[PDB]
Amino acid sequence: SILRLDRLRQFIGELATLLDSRPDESTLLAQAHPLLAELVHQDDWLPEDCARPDPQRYQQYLLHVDSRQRFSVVSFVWGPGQITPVHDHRVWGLIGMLRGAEYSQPYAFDAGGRPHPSGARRRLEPGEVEALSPRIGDVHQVSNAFSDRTSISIHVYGANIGAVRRAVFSAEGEEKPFISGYSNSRLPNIWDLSKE
Amino acid sequence: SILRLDRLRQFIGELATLLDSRPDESTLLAQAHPLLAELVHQDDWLPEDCARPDPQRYQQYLLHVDSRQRFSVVSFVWGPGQITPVHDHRVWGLIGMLRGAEYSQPYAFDAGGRPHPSGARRRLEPGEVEALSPRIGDVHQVSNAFSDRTSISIHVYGANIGAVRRAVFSAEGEEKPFISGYSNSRLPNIWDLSKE
Ligand SMILES: [Cl-]
Ligand SMILES: [Fe+2]
Ligand SMILES: [Fe+2]
Ligand code: NA
Ligand code: NA
Ligand code: NA
Ligand code: NA
């Protein structure tokens, strides 16, 4: 229909313009917050392909990578009742819920290296944005708040996320290196303005 | 084999860096010339979908658009004997032959505003790169050099080319506005390094 891809195009240039200032981390996050907020304020732009859950696993659909890999934009699609392992990120980020809701559980470790939840579980509603900086709390376990519907969140990461070597942590406290990869081997073409 | 997608990721990055120093047109073109030349020096990187001829029309497969739309990178696929009409561009651009060959005829205008071939036709061989710009010469007709095979060239343009309002030129020298648009509504995912 009127898939409104101009808001994706707008978010992307504006994040990039912002980044062209070499802002310090915390300024960057502060100033991007409203930008992602304006992008998830309404749910009328996300291409269908980039919204399909899987029955076995969550999906990360790559929407855009910056020419200099200063950021990537990803659509995180949880099927009903799905849950990630405990893992870190290693780059700045922002998350904004588009539809459904998700839970975020922060983690820390005992001197042995076993993880344990820390602070309580945050619930993220359609519309809300929280900045992540690894300089604060990098390790977490996230999950679909709902057990019976699809939830989707739009993420922004300060790198090509599917190139970042990060870590997943078992209950027993072993660090497994992982690289997330992407669900889609093709990105949507948000760029064909030959439609008006 | 495995596609050498890192050549493309590298080119994308390097040209954006170059663009970050705000060069003037002649320096941008002198410096970008070698970067594209390296990309089209060996033919081990273009995804197969982005190399597909059409029997009716030449194809324009979008590869990448820069976050701030400072450039875009397009794969231009010619089937046997295809030819464009006479047209302009209104942005700087570099063209780099990947496989096959294309003929280039620049055009100039007489006192009544009617276009005519200006100068000798230029043949573009694999690994060669030519520049174009309103300053340096913008109006031309291009065709596949062969009628017995496919030709591909890699085009870089200082805008989101398929959103740029340009024009084709009638024998009587009048515009007919056009916006090229892209043969592909999905872009290739160059970015999933977790392949290796
Ligand atoms: Cl030249
Ligand atoms: Fe995470
Ligand atoms: Fe042209
Ligand atoms: Na290269
Ligand atoms: Na190829
Ligand atoms: Na000329
Ligand atoms: Na493709």
From Swiss-Prot, chains A, B:
It is an enzyme of class 1 (oxidoreductase). The keyword Cytoplasm does not apply. Binds 1 Fe(2+) ion per subunit. InterPro entries: CDO_1, RmlC-like_jellyroll, RmlC_Cupin_sf. Its EC number is 1.13.11.91. Fe cation binds at H87, H89, H140. It catalyses: 3-sulfanylpropanoate + O2 = 3-sulfinopropanoate + H(+). One of its GO terms (molecular function) is iron ion binding. Pfam families: CDO_I (PF05995). Keywords: Dioxygenase, Iron, Metal-binding, Oxidoreductase. Induction: Is expressed in low levels (at protein level). Its cofactor is Fe(2+). Does not contain a cysteine-tyrosine cross-link observed in all mammalian cysteine dioxygenase (CDO) structures. Forms homodimer in the crystal; however, there is no evidence that the dimer exists under physiological conditions or has biological significance. Belongs to the cysteine dioxygenase family. PANTHER family: CYSTEINE DIOXYGENASE (PTHR12918), CYSTEINE DIOXYGENASE TYPE 1 (PTHR12918:SF1). Thiol dioxygenase that catalyzes the dioxygenation of 3-mercaptopropionate (3-MPA) to 3-sulfinopropionate (3-SPA). To a lesser extent (40-fold lower efficiency), is also able to oxidize cysteine to cysteine sulfinate (CSA). Cannot use N-acetyl-L-cysteine, homocysteine, and cysteamine as substrates. The physiological role of this enzyme is unclear. This is 3-mercaptopropionate dioxygenase. It comes from Pseudomonas aeruginosa (strain ATCC 15692 / DSM 22644 / CIP 104116 / JCM 14847 / LMG 12228 / 1C / PRS 101 / PAO1).
